[PDB]
């Protein structure tokens, strides 16, 4: 009986040196992400809407243009909702599908439904248009390195649909795409032909981005079984800072702070966490001041902060994948 599902417990990163760090910092472009990945997503895109369809096409097109061998799958399903049965479509983008282990990055691409108010439309810029754009920019920035994957370990990106409640949060009205996908992965043998392991056993770690884009975020270290990875993010941030590779950044105002959070935040990671998947939840606490208001828009985003987080995330992913 192979013990491969236990490999994630001992997996160590291959740390990048100063020269490699400057290379990653220089290889990501916040302006290119802003224009090519983010702005097309700043539209109303609640489940079932025309924008939802456009958001999905944009995400798949941006991934398809890359050199790395991404395999795209649309996970479509029905769920009961406060408005009756509806259709949802999760987007999964995977490198090396049959690879036993995958580091998984995720966000949600739906926007919370709100009827237009005084001509304003809710576009959830930090929630989660920026998280989505950051995952696309990461795929683009690291493309050449990721192409080399073409440790039976690779990368997967999930863009969840229906993360938001159609009304206010309730157990049955929210996390539609993630509750669905988690149950589906839990019941799908992996790798193909496996006798007793599922795709969930193959998830080394689920890195979930949400509510990112506001000034001064503080991410707490939520879970003891991913704490050593939270620490790597802290170390990365510290070294990029010391190397002068971050913008308008101070250690006193660092994003990854030492401190836990006793409570529970409802997000797409819940369905996975409750099935035993290690989670690194990159959601700040407190939430952005614009959370769930018409002001969660482009104008209120903090460009340098998003740029700095792109650098930190990219380094983290390369070091995890030994790239
Ligand atoms: Zn939200």
UniProtKB/Swiss-Prot annotation:
Effect of residue 266 to L: Lowers activity by approximately 35%
Result, substituting residue 114 to A: Lowers activity by approximately 30%
Classification via Gene3D superfamilies: Zn peptidases
Chief place where the protein resides: secreted
SS bonds (residue pairs): 107-132
A single BP term in Gene Ontology: protein modification process
MF-aspect GO terms: glutaminyl-peptide cyclotransferase activity; zinc ion binding
Catalytic residues, chain numbering: 163 (proton acceptor), 210 (proton acceptor)
Consequence of changing residue 22 to W: Lowers activity by approximately 30%
Residues with glycosylation annotation: 17, 258
UniProt keyword annotations, A-Z: Acyltransferase, Disulfide bond, Glycoprotein, Metal-binding, Secreted, Signal, Transferase, Zinc
Mutagenesis or variant effect for residue 287 to A: Greatly lowers activity
Catalytic reaction(s) noted: N-terminal L-glutaminyl-[peptide] = N-terminal 5-oxo-L-prolyl-[peptide] + NH4(+)
Recorded GO CC terms: extracellular exosome; extracellular region; ficolin-1-rich granule lumen; specific granule lumen; tertiary granule lumen
Residue numbers binding Zn(2+): 127, 164, 292
UniProt subcellular location: Secreted
Domain of life assignment: Eukaryota
Known outcome of mutating residue 169 to L: Greatly lowers activity
Classification via InterPro entries: M28_QC, Peptidase_M28, QC/QCL
Enzyme class, UniProt record, top EC level: transferase
Family stated for the protein in its record: Belongs to the glutaminyl-peptide cyclotransferase family.
This protein's name: Glutaminyl-peptide cyclotransferase
Source species of the chain: Homo sapiens
Gene: QPCT
